Write a protein that binds this ligand. Structure first.
Ligand SMILES: CCCCCCCCCCCCCCCCCC(=O)OC[C@H](COP(=O)([O-])OCC[N+](C)(C)C)OC(=O)CCCCCCCCCCCCCCCCC
Ligand SMILES: CCCCCCCCCCCCCCCCCC(=O)OC[C@H](COP(=O)([O-])OCC[N+](C)(C)C)OC(=O)CCCCCCCCCCCCCCCCC
Ligand SMILES: CCCCCCCCCCCCCCCCCC(=O)OC[C@H](COP(=O)(O)OCCN)OC(=O)CCCCCCCCCCCCCCCCC
Ligand SMILES: CCCCCCCCCCCCCCCCCC(=O)OC[C@H](COP(=O)(O)OCCN)OC(=O)CCCCCCCCCCCCCCCCC
Ligand SMILES: CCCCCCCCCCCCCCCCCC(=O)OC[C@H](COP(=O)(O)OCCN)OC(=O)CCCCCCCCCCCCCCCCC
Ligand SMILES: CCCCCCCCCCCCCCCCCC(=O)OC[C@H](COP(=O)(O)OCCN)OC(=O)CCCCCCCCCCCCCCCCC
Ligand SMILES: C=C(C)[C@H]1Cc2c(ccc3c2O[C@@H]2COc4cc(OC)c(OC)cc4[C@@H]2C3=O)O1
Ligand SMILES: C=C(C)[C@H]1Cc2c(ccc3c2O[C@@H]2COc4cc(OC)c(OC)cc4[C@@H]2C3=O)O1
Ligand code: SF4
Ligand code: SF4
Ligand code: SF4
Lengths: 314, 110, 97, 80, 176, 70, 156, 360
């Protein structure tokens, strides 16, 4: 019975990631005064199916690798970490209800940079290794503000429990007392997933240009399996929905609608701006987000003490 | 226990899909390719700035590790001492950032 | 409300292709279901439609026949299936069919 | 004092907001009247068992029952 | 008679400095850009439904070559080789002889459609309106030499498209 | 027009609705028609194992009330 | 028989998935790239056919040789073709890619890219219209549609 | 991160255009100029046509001059839409590419209606233009131009005040004016550096002395001022197109010297002199008198010049093609020193480099 719960978690994750490609192409199409796919399925609904089948029957490279084993371990770690991020997400009840789900997700998302690093190792191209090192330094830069913003908010939560965060926002959204944290958090999750304006894997050649259609479709989909997750995590963190314990699907419809609107907000951001130069987003993290994030972390340390609003431990 | 079941299931599904991806087009006998990069064969030069941003991440990540028990530390009965040490730790993180600023350590990846 | 007029125009697009069978037929063959005025039909079965309220480029279209010169063209419709007397009209080289 | 402040607010408004929020976070718990109640609520939260006392004969300030009027009360918390 | 793009000094009163810092910290121009992109989300797109809808063309359009005939069936071409003299790519190869009734006609008329630059100098050099560059643009092949047209393919393009070429020349001969 | 993107968004929304409604129905099924007991803390685990003992059928969720005492 | 019907349905499936998910490399040489962009533009909109541009030849399916192939570039074009995973297709676009065109008799121009790469669809024009390039891409899709890979594999 | 040296290797589109021109007539050599700067087709046609007409000692009729200026400013819109939107597409802004190529599609419909080809028209010819405007064309050019300002306004909404766009352009690609003149830069590459030089004002050709327009002048010489100069040149091109549509005269569209421009097809089929002249123009071509001109125009990338040498025959002896992008890409090495690799692609975008004109 628990295995049925695991499968109804992880198979709809891959289906939602598949149709997120269609939603991306359609929404980017209409924002660009054109259409997205509408030929392959009715309203393009068979486009991700045809695309996944097309990739799975292309010839892989199997190049001269510095490591064959890490060439294999990069998609496996990517998909495994991209699927295990979803297991403490309370919607309204989680698969694994753990006391430290927030810190769990922070640690497992910190583990995701090894996919980028091993994919840069496995290609013998030294320029792909350079781009992988730039991607890793980008991701570990924005993990700092992820950790500190998340700590500042959990100072208003009371615990590391993700299901407590629904109880925290029963009166007000947590974007109202923490919108500067929310906007730096949202841009930092945008910079975590190598997503535009923070993507540096299409132009000055990325870390996963060595992969062609066997592992690539897996990498990509693991990457989008992070993106929805991060928005769902943002939905739990700043836009907490109403939970009726006798009708849990009210919460499930409400957080699903908010997470869809936030993933579409990612799509609507990448269709609206140019990219950063690499040192410009390093300037954005280390000189603009990090002083504000430290200042607001001091503010959210001292603020529940000065208002007598320290949240419950349990 | 159910957690290990979930982790093992995700690793199993990932290994299944990766093996099918690596070996369903290896059923094909497409063609045998010989195929005889921006740099040709030059050795990868060390970039000092990339190492500096990695160590700056490591040290600020340790300062984050000190900051992590604060939601539990707000439940103490010694709140004056706790608030003082919390503001002191975030201030020392800010001082490490200010020294990293003013000594030009955050330059060309600013 | 002006959303009711939108849903009623969609339902009469369903009713305007001769029911659900014709609606799904033109939806899967054409990937477009809007209705127009039948301007004509050639000796092959290509049907030519106007809608002057659509914008310039959408305002004239062909539904290709399902069988032309012995070839099944239910799915394999072709841009060069248009005969030359309708090729001026469909490419807007003239106002007159 | 306002020329340098307007200059840094025109050049570096991120750092002005940072130093201002940091200064408020430092100095404001020493000025808030509610900082006493944080301490009071965190000591009123009974994580452990209230281990009873052996009645020696003379402890008037200790109750004999939870519903007795003597002892610590939390009416300051029920009102706030 | 000249103007200076980007020669504005921003105002330095507290109103404008606070406006610029609210733009910096609260991201006003970025929300402007998101709003312009959302404004295009709710527009009808410009996409036509090819091949069921076609891009608009004029009767001057320069597409696939064809040889025309008179309204008696006699072909218009009298082998004068003006089209291959004017041809900027040397795409036209003509050989002629007097045929059995003594008429001046071609024995070879080749147009390499892979040398041809589709500029239409041949149709405007032609004194009898024989070679024309017709309305067809949908003639992609799977083989290189299927675009190496000889006289038979060109006379068949004339016989194929004459019902349309005659109307385009009817609509455009008074501009010529 | 812009309502053409809504079938893909609706399919993706159903795919995001399935895990939550699934785990809600499974937790109601496996726990006697009720929510799964949350045991983050050892007191919660002690009460839950005491429920498993006092139920008599080796299930924490089988509740016994005043009818179980004389 | 039965296995003949099985491999026929499997050929239809894999041909459907390959023709309906073509990925050209965003790679233009000369004036034909402008019209290839107009076929990427909103009026024609190749993305609604499942036809997207990708930067790398590793995640690409068809090489649209759109422009003049000179003598100085032909090894780079061949290297781009050799980095593409199979099944890879080539659409020669325009007169210079087809047979040299206006620069046919030049000292520096490869007379047709079919001296360098095998070519599947020759699209004629100088440039062909963007509508004509989309015609060539749909003819490429119909060519992929009638491929008989598993039927020939089952008969060999 | 720093760029010490940038060595561009070109010749990948070198096709030997101007050796092929020496073996073709003047009319046969005209369509090579469409294919040099292949987003500026009729501008290069106009440059070569002015060169040939200067060697022929003839002049086009006034209506042909106004059609040349009208379609040259439509061409300037085409080239700056290509320039700005691909310069934004490389930096990352991919959406106004799609927003502005529909207006560019409508202008290609204008080329197709006037000539029959969407890009390489071969329309502006020495002696006038090939063919008169079709009836109803100028109304549609009016309906395009009346609405094009809002398209520029929403492009400029998406880029000009954007902080990510400004951080990729403002400190980047600074050229001092003296080094811009010494490196042979022209067009926006000069006028971004504050130089008040535009060949439509200073050395005016066909009827540019009769149209009223402004010349946008940069102040800092960076990528951002050159961007704003191209946006305001699109604005002033809309101004010129409004004036050309209001002031189009009647009359003929070729020079009525029938030893240069071919006669009408009705009179070629009636008159003996017209058939002889049609024959000899479309086989031999007109003889150009011996001599060498350097005729330059203000094409939308800069000074586009032809050094054309006739030996008296009906074929050019020599045809050197001065393109702006050649000297601009030569100056790329100086413009990129002290910048980064993601800045060099912005410099390559703001020098509007099309390698057809770079390589010939
Ligand atoms: C989670 C839900 C969604 C959240 C909101 C996000 C949705 C909208 C997204 C829009 C598109 C964004 C795309 C990425 C953009 C990245 C670039 C960018 O914006 O850089 C950030 C820019 C960086 O600066 P910059 O790049 O604009 O300028 C260059 C930097 N200097 C000036 C140093 C040269 O701004 C910030 O860092 C601001 C971050 C948030 C600030 C929050 C301030 C709180 C206010 C406190 C009070 C202040 C008043 C004074 C004191 C009062 C005391 C009582
Ligand atoms: C995760 C969901 C999506 C999964 C992937 C999509 C589902 C379908 C997967 C199987 C499709 C068929 C096999 C892969 C595609 C084969 C394409 C191809 O070129 O085949 C020719 C190849 C080889 O045929 P060939 O002999 O003509 O080879 C051509 C190469 N030369 C001539 C040089 C030797 O066929 C095979 O390898 C057959 C493999 C098994 C086919 C299916 C058997 C039944 C499966 C049920
Ligand atoms: C190259 C090698 C292969 C690489 C690919 C595969 C590995 C990477 C992807 C998988 C990562 C596995 C991470 C597993 C542990 C995560 C942390 C964790 O368990 O936290 C959750 C929870 C803590 O919360 P709490 O509520 O206190 O616990 C219940 C008590 N009431 O704790 C619990 O609930 C405790 C449950 C029992 C103990 C669980 C132990 C799990 C197995 C150990 C790790 C296995 C993976 C080893 C490799 C890691 C990566 C290198
Ligand atoms: C006491 C309160 C708590 C203080 C400790 C906590 C701070 C929280 C924020 C942490 C920030 C960490 C990094 C700080 C570095 C400061 C030094 C600095 O940045 O100096 C350089 C800068 C000029 O910038 P530059 O060197 O060119 O850098 C590239 C950007 N152009 O020059 C500047 O930017 C000038 C900076 C000084 C002036 C700032 C004045 C702000 C006033 C706000 C209102 C009053 C707040 C009360 C506290 C007083 C603060 C001065
Ligand atoms: C959580 C929600 C998840 C939802 C995921 C799925 C979303 C999309 C759902 C399907 C949408 C409609 C699909 C219709 C496809 C086209 C059908 C069709 O008519 O195909 C025609 C084709 C050839 O027909 P033929 O007979 O040759 O025509 C000659 C006529 N004289 O005939 C054929 O190709 C053969 C028939 C093919 C039918 C394929 C239908 C789609 C299959 C998709 C797989 C997933 C289905 C849903 C799974 C969850 C629900 C159970
Ligand atoms: C014993 C018998 C069974 C033997 C084993 C076979 C099992 C079933 C395999 C799948 C179905 C096989 C048939 C495949 C399609 C055949 C018919 C066909 O080609 O129809 C063409 C039609 C599109 O026509 P087209 O020319 O593209 O239209 C142009 C627009 N005017 O096409 C359409 O309208 C739509 C075609 C849809 C094809 C089916 C749907 C995709 C496959 C779903 C199952 C596999 C993938 C599962 C999910 C993977 C993860 C996403
Ligand atoms: C996971 C499934 C079902 C399929 C669908 C799919 C892949 C793998 C990769 C991709 C993909 O869908 C889209 C395809 O088109 C573009 C086009 C893009 O830009 C034009 C773009 O830019 C980031 C991204 C993409 C996706 C992309 O890389 O596997
Ligand atoms: C990404 C999309 C949707 C468009 C834009 C685009 C293509 C396809 C190909 C290319 C491209 O743009 C880049 C940059 O701009 C030019 C401009 C060119 O000439 C003006 C040129 O000539 C070869 C080549 C290019 C690139 C090129 O190969 O599709
Ligand atoms: S259109 Fe031009 S290149 Fe083609 S055959 Fe005619 S004259 Fe020659
Ligand atoms: S097609 Fe015309 S120009 Fe060419 S040889 Fe024949 S008659 Fe002369
Ligand atoms: S075939 Fe012609 S128009 Fe096309 S790229 Fe070549 S020269 Fe340019």
């Amino acid at each position: 019975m628990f295995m049925i719960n695991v499968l109804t978690l992880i198979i709809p994750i891959l289906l939602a990631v598949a149709f997120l490609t269609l939603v991306e192409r359609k929404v980017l199409g209409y924002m660009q005064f054109r259409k997205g796919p509408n030929v392959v399925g009715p309203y393009g609904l068979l486009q991700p199916i045809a695309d996944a089948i097309k990739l799975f029957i292309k010839e892989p490279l199997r190049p001269a690798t510095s490591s064959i084993s890490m060439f294999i371990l990069a998609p496996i770690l990517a998909l495994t970490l991209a699927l295990t991020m979803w297991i403490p997400l309370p919607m309204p009840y989680p698969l694994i209800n753990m006391n430290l789900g927030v810190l769990f997700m922070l640690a497992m998302s910190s583990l995701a940079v090894y996919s980028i690093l091993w994919s840069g190792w496995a290609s013998n191209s030294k320029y792909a290794l350079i781009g992988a090192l730039r991607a890793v330094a980008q991701t570990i830069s924005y993990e700092v503000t992820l950790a500190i913003i998340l700590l500042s908010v959990l100072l208003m939560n009371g615990s590391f429990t993700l299901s407590t965060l629904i109880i925290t926002q029963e009166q007000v959204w947590l974007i109202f007392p923490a919108w500067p944290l929310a906007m730096m958090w949202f841009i930092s999750t945008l910079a975590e997933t190598n997503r535009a304006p923070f993507d540096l894997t299409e132009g000055e050649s990325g870390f996963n240009v060595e992969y062609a259609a066997g592992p690539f479709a897996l990498f990509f989909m693991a990457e989008y399996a992070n993106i929805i997750m991060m928005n769902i995590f943002t939905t739990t963190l700043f836009l907490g929905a109403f939970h009726n314990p006798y009708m849990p699907e009210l919460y499930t419809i409400n957080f699903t609608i908010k997470s869809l609107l936030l993933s579409i907000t990612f799509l609507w951001i990448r269709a609206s701006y140019p990219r950063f130069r690499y040192d410009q987003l390093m300037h954005l993290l280390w000189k603009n987000f990090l002083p504000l994030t430290l200042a607001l972390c001091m503010w959210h340390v001292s603020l529940p003490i000065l208002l007598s609003s320290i949240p419950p431990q349990t | 226990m159910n957690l290990m079941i979930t982790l093992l299931t995700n690793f199993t599904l990932a290994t299944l899909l990766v093996t099918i991806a690596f070996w369903l087009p290896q059923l094909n006998v497409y063609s045998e390719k010989t195929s005889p990069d921006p740099m040709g064969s030059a050795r990868l030069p060390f970039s000092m700035k990339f190492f500096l941003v990695a160590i700056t991440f490591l040290l600020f990540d340790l300062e984050i590790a000190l900051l992590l028990p604060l939601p539990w530390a707000s439940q103490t009965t010694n709140l004056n001492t706790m608030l003082t040490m919390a503001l002191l730790l975030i201030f020392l993180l800010a001082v490490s950032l200010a020294y990293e600023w003013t000594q030009k350590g955050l330059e060309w990846t600013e | 409300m002006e959303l009711l007029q939108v849903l009623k125009r969609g339902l009469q697009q369903v009713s305007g292709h001769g029911g659900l069978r014709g609606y799904l037929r033109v939806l899967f063959r054409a990937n477009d279901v809007r209705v127009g005025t039948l301007v004509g039909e050639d000796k092959y079965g290509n049907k030519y439609y106007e809608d002057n309220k659509q914008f310039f480029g959408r305002h004239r279209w062909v539904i290709y026949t399902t069988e032309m010169n012995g070839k099944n063209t239910f799915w394999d419709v072709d841009g060069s299936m248009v005969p030359p007397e309708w090729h001026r009209w469909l490419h807007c080289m003239t106002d007159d069919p | 004092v306002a020329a340098f402040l307007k200059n840094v607010w025109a050049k570096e408004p991120v750092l002005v907001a940072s130093f201002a929020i940091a200064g408020l976070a430092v100095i404001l718990p020493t000025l808030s009247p509610y900082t006493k109640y944080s301490l009071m609520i965190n000591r009123a939260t009974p994580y452990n068992y209230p281990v009873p006392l052996r009645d020696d004969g003379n402890m008037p300030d200790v109750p004999s029952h939870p519903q007795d009027p003597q002892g610590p009360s939390l009416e300051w918390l029920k009102r706030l | 008679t000249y103007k200076y793009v980007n020669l504005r000094e921003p105002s330095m009163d507290m109103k404008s400095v606070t406006d610029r810092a609210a733009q910096t910290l609260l991201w006003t121009e970025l929300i402007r850009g998101l709003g312009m992109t959302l404004s295009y989300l709710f527009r009808e797109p410009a996409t036509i439904n090819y091949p069921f809808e076609k891009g608009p063309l004029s009767p001057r359009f320069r597409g696939e070559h064809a040889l025309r005939r008179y309204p008696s069936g006699e072909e218009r071409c009298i082998a004068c080789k003006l089209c291959e003299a004017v041809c900027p790519a040397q795409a036209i190869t003509i050989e002629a002889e007097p045929r059995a009734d003594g008429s001046r006609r071609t024995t070879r008329y080749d147009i390499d459609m892979t040398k041809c630059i589709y500029c239409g100098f041949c149709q405007e050099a032609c004194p009898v309106d024989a070679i024309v560059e017709g309305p067809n643009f949908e003639f992609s092949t799977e083989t290189h030499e299927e675009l190496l047209y000889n006289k038979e393919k060109l006379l068949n393009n004339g016989d194929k498209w004459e019902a349309e070429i005659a109307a385009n020349i009817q609509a455009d001969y008074l501009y010529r | 027009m812009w309502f053409e993107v809504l079938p893909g968004i609706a399919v993706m929304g159903v795919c995001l609705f399935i895990p939550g409604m699934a785990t809600a129905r499974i937790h109601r099924f496996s726990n006697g028609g009720r929510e799964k007991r949350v045991a983050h803390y050892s007191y919660q685990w002690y009460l839950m194992e005491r429920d498993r003992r006092v139920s008599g059928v080796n299930r924490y969720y089988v509740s016994k009330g005043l009818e179980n005492i004389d | 028989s039965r296995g003949e019907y099985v491999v026929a349905k499997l050929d239809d499936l894999i041909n459907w998935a390959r023709r309906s998910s073509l990925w050209p490399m965003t790679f233009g040489l000369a004036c034909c790239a402008v019209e290839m962009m107009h076929m990427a533009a909103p009026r024609y909109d190749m993305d609604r056919f499942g036809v997207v541009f990708r930067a790398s030849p590793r995640q690409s399916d068809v090489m649209i040789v759109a422009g003049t192939l000179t003598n100085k570039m032909a090894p780079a074009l061949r290297k781009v073709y050799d980095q593409m995973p199979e099944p890879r297709y080539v659409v020669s676009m325009g007169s210079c890619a087809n047979g040299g065109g206006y620069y046919h008799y030049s000292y520096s121009v490869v007379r047709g890219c079919d001296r360098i790469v095998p070519v599947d669809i020759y699209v004629p024009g100088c440039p062909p219209t963007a509508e004509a390039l989309l015609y060539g891409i749909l003819q490429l899709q119909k060519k992929i549609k009638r491929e008989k890979r598993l039927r020939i594999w089952y008969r060999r | 991160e720093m760029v010490r040296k940038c060595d561009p290797h070109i010749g990948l589109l070198h096709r030997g255009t101007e050796k092929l021109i020496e073996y073709k007539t003047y009319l046969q050599a005209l369509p090579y100029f469409d294919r040099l700067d292949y987003v500026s087709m009729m501008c290069n046609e106009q440059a070569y046509s002015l060169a040939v007409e200067k060697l022929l000692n003839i002049q086009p009729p006034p209506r042909a001059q106004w059609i040349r200026v009208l379609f040259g400013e439509i061409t300037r819109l085409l080239n700056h839409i290509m320039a700005v939107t691909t310069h934004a597409l490389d930096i990352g802004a991919m959406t106004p590419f799609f927003w502005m190529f529909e207006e560019r599609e409508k202008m290609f419909e204008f080329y197709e209606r006037v000539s029959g080809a969407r890009m390489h028209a071969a329309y502006v010819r020495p002696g006038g233009v090939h063919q008169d405007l079709p009836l109803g064309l100028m109304d549609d050019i009016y309906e395009f131009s009346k609405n094009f300002s809002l398209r520029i306004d929403e492009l400029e909404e998406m880029l000009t005040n954007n902080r990510i766009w400004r951080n990729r352009t403002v400190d980047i690609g600074v050229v001092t004016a003296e080094d811009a003149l010494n490196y042979g830069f022209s067009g926006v590459m000069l006028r971004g550096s504050g130089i008040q030089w535009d060949l439509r004002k200073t050395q005016p050709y066909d009827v540019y002395d009769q149209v009223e327009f402004d010349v946008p002048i940069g102040s800092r010489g960076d990528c951002y001022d050159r961007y704003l100069c191209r946006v305001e040149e699109m604005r002033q091109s809309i101004r010129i197109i409004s004036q050309c549509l209001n002031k189009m005269p009647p009359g003929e569209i070729k020079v009525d010297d029938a030893k240069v421009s071919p006669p009408k097809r009705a009179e070629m089929k009636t008159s003996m002199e017209s058939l002889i002249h049609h024959f000899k123009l479309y086989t031999e071509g007109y003889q150009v008198p011996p001599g060498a001109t350097y005729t330059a125009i203000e094409a939308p990338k800069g000074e586009f010049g032809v050094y054309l040498v006739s030996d008296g025959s009906s074929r050019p002896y020599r045809c050197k093609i001065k393109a702006p992008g050649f000297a601009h890409l030569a100056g790329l090495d100086k413009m990129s020193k002290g910048h980064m690799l993601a800045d060099v692609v912005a410099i390559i975008g703001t020098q509007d480099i099309v390698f057809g004109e770079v390589d010939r």
